[PDB]
Each structure stands twice: as C-alpha cells, then as structure tokens.
Amino acid sequence: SSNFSFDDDNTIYGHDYVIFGLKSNQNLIVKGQFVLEIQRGAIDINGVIYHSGVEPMKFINPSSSSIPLIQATQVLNSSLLENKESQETPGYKSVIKLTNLDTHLESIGRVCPLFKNLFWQFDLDQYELAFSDYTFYPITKPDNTVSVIKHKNWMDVIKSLTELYSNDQSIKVIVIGGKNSGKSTFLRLLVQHMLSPTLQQLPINFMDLDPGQPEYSGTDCISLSKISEVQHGNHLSLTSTDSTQCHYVGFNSPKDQPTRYNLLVEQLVRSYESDGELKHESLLINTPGWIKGYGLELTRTLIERVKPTHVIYLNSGTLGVDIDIKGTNLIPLQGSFNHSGSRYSSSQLRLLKTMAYFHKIDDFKFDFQPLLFSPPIQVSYGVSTGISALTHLKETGIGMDHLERSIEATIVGIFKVKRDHLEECFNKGQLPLLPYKEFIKLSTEFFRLALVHSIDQEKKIMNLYIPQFRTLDLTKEAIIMVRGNTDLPIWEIASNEIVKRFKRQLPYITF
C-alpha cells in the first residue's frame, strides 16, 4: 500500500498542466502519462538528480510495471538549475510542474476490456472533493501499486559502475537473468543513471538481444540503439529512441532458429564494435530469458565474443561454476511483484507491444481504432519490384499453393534486399517463395513489420497494414517479405467495434 504526501500543496489545476509545490519530505508516485519540467528546486527521480534547468521529461509508466519515485528531498546544490516562476518561489522547498501528455494511448479500452486501467482516465461515485480528470494524477490515497525502489545494493552496484562512466574509460556490460528476474528494470535503471544531467550528454550504446521480452525494441527484434534521451517510464517499447537497426529474428525465443540467432547477434556485435571501439559509446547488452541450458551456452558464447569488462547475473546458481569468475557481479533478483491482473502476463503484454506498433501515428501519438478502416496500402507480389518474395523462417516446408494463404491475416516482416542479392537462388507464379537457405546467406535490412489483410488471388496485389513509414523508394532494393513466429493479437482482427459493426461470420475467428 504505497502512498505519498497528500497535497494540499497550494496546487493550481491549470488546463493542460498541474503545478506542484513539494516540501522537503514530499515525494510523488504518479500513475498515468505526463510530461514535467521543474519550475523550482531539483527533483530527484529514481536515483538521479534532475534540477530545474533540465529539459522536460516524458513518462509512460504503466500499471503493469512499478512507478518510479519522484522525490523532492534533495536540496538544490548546483547553479545549473534554472528556475522560472510565474506564480506565487515562496521559499517552500521545490516546486515542479507536470503537463498532460495526451498520448491517446489510454484509449485501449476500445479494443480490449481487460486492458482498462492500465492507462488511467478513471475507469464509481467521486470520493474526494476538487477532483479533476487528466491523463495523469498521483495516487493520493494508498493503493496497490508497486513503486520503483530496490535494495541499497541494487542501486549501489549501478552507482558504482556509474562514476566509472564519469571518467574517460568506457564500459561494456552484460546482464543475465531469467524471465521475471528483473533484467528490464535493471537496464532501465542503469540507462537512467548513465544519462543523468550531471554526467556528459554522451549517448549510450544499448544492445538488446532479447526477442521474447524486448526493451527499446519492437516485437521480435534484436536491436542496437544509441540512446541519447532516457525513457523515464516503462515505455512498452513505444518511444523512438533512435536505433541503427532492428533485426528481425522472427521468433519469441532463441531456440527456434539458433543459427540465424547466432549469426544475427554476431553481426550486431560487429556493428557495435564499429562504433563501440570509439570509446564514447558505453556498450550495453541484454540477454534472453534463458538462464540455463542452451541459453546459458549462448550467454557464454556472447561473453567470450564481447570482451565483457562487466557481467551481471540476477539469480544465484550454477552460473559461477559455468561462467569463470573476467569480472562478474552478483545481484539478487528482486523481481517486480504485482498481481497478474495488475501485471499482465509477458505473453499477454507482447500482444500490447505488437498492437501498439501498428497503431502508432507517431512516437507519442496512438490511434487505437481498428486498422480496417484505414487504407490497406496495396502492394504488388511476384517478380514485380514492389514486393518480390516470401520466406518462411522455420516451417520452410510448405505447399507452394499454401504459403499464399499462410501469410493472409498474419504479421510478417518486410525486409530489404539490394541489387541482385535477391536473384540468388521458385515459381512466379502466384508467389515466388524465396527459400530460407538462400535467405540466410543474403544480407537484409529490416523495414517495419507488416500486417497482411485479405490476400487477393486473382491479382498479385495484396493489402498491407504497416505503421508509420516513409515512402519505400528503392532503385533496385526489392522489399522481400518473411513470416516468422510472431503472433497476431485478436483485437486487431476482431474487436468489439468491428464485431458489433458486422456480427456476421468473420473469416479467421470462431465464436
């Protein structure tokens, strides 16, 4: 039953922003979407010091994850703080102001009735006076929301590693842990700590080799991302965080295509050594949810592949025997604790991370009306330059009449193959079906994931629902298509707003 100091802080409601004046002991746990600057003093958020001068920060803390503490305890000790006062300031500690994000990502109740209250707009008679409804508001009364705070050893290891980033020498990091061990929270804390305003604004190099529970990466990618701006909440991989490339493994776990996974990881590590050698970018790695078995073998191969200079394990076990002690750290799991209803399952939240991918107009604009009403973005198929070939990543053996139906109403990754690399080698024909064996050898650049809708057979044209994308203008770079293992959420095939709209026998669903 976590709670914060009730206010009662001479706060003014405003229209799109709320002004808070926090006392010395005052703290905030805020549920919802909000952007805040600091009008006076230096607010300390999750173990780093943010003064008034720092640029506004954008929060996407979800009910699934824990809420980062927003402390005002730290008295302003530096002149870097730039305080602008238009009200009252009054000499009462620090005053911070937070503005409505209006991300429109809260409007998920339209598709799913269980994903309500994940992003809150009060979804029941009012029990408090002067209540107002915004996209954000802190929980004044105690409630069952876990806050982001760990044992002093957890923050101590990260802080001790942090001043090692303060000086010239660069840091490469490994993080090892099982699913629900807390690797995501550890990485978000570490990236928040390395990009504090006190440290130089030098972008960290973040490598995420986890397809199942990815961070800073859309569903089913291996991704390297130079992070120049920290993501202050649990953005469900729903913020830009400019990245060099998002590598489509196509599978939830490493085991499905171990050779492609290893080749992709080694290529991404080589691309990181193209820039990590420059020593400005402190390379940082996430590892899959596998803690034992072939996952441990992959972790060891990575450790000998990337000169570690640091390794973190989240659970104590046979890792010390398996991994040579070469410096490694030991930190207990301290995994996030929340109810299954409040903290949706990883397989149940992958569906959100997949849906919001196609439903994003921009980085922070989210329109969650069913995709069907939008134009299908018709594309060609065959030897045509629009989209050339199909590659099934795992189930390679498929009837030449059956793959075309297979990709109908399923999530496929649109790749990019330049010049004659696509010409390296079936029947075109209804659909060429570039084989996976020739696919692995060819180098591919990953364009955004595609949702397929209503394959047309009489014409090669096939509809394709893809998120925000620039015009795919290529001189000869054919954008081939692949099918992985990535699942398709029901809500974008059949939600209430289109089932009630039609109510007839829909193609791919049963009642």
Partner: protein, 148 residues
C-alpha cells in the same frame, strides 16, 4: 469471447476430416490415400505456421506421417522408423496427459511410453500397432465429432 483459428471460415476442419479419413478406406488406392495423407499433413503444417493448432490436430498430422513411414518400410535398418514412431507416440500421449485413464487413453500408450523412454526401444510391429491405435483414438475422440 472470440477465438482465433488458422483456417478461414472454419470449414477446412471438415476438409481435414475427409482428407485424413476419406469416405472409403479400402476401395481407395493406397498411393492416392497416402497423397491425401501428405496433403493433410501439409495443411496442418500451414496452420502451425499461421498459429498454434490444437494438440489433437498436430498429433494427427504426426501420427499419420508415422503411419505412412511404418507401412511403407522396405526393410533394413529399422532404427530410424522405430525411433520416430516412438517419439510420435510419446509426444501424442504426453500432450494428452500434460494438461487414471479418465481421458479414456488405453494403457497400451502408457506402457509404450515407458518402453520407449526408459526401457528397450519398441519393435517395428509394436510401433505399427500403437500408431494405428492412436489414429483410431484421435478419430473416435475428436474427428468423428466435428461435422458440417
């Protein structure tokens, strides 16, 4: 409330019923029957590519591939076919019992699992009997019920 099925309009389960279990089991040519079996296995693979399939349908696809292998054996090193049929039976029975014989599973399958997993490898004839028994079981418990 809605559920997702890989097959369009849910009439291709009727198609798999006739393609796995054709109308006539003896007047039909065995070569054409095995072509029908292979087509059904290809469709089950396609539905697996689309999404998860019910364990009964995946087990039917595996069991009919094992049946085609066993009945088309030409002799020689039977190490491969015995191992594959043993694994098919083990996956089928374990997937059934993973979620007493309350499910009406015969004791033959459970004995076969112990023989193959821990004991000596089951013989070719025993595998032929067990795969046919499993093919009958899935039919009686799932495939006869589904109609149009």
């Amino acid at each position: 409330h809605p559920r997702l099925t890989p097959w369009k309009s849910s009439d291709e389960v009727v198609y798999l019923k006739g393609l796995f279990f054709p109308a006539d089991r003896e007047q039909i040519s065995r070569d054409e029957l095995y072509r029908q079996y292979e087509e059904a296995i290809s469709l089950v693979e396609m539905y697996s590519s689309r999404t998860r399939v019910s364990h009964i349908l995946q087990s039917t696809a595996h069991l009919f591939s094992a049946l085609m292998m066993l009945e088309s054996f030409e002799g020689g090193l039977d190490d491969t076919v015995r191992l594959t049929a043993s694994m098919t039976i083990i996956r089928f029975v374990n997937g059934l019992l993973d979620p007493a014989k309350k499910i009406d599973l015969p004791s033959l399958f459970v004995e076969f699992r112990h023989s193959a997993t821990h004991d000596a490898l089951p013989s070719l004839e025993m595998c032929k009997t067990c795969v046919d028994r499993a093919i009958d079981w899935v039919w009686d418990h799932y495939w006869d019920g589904v109609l149009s």
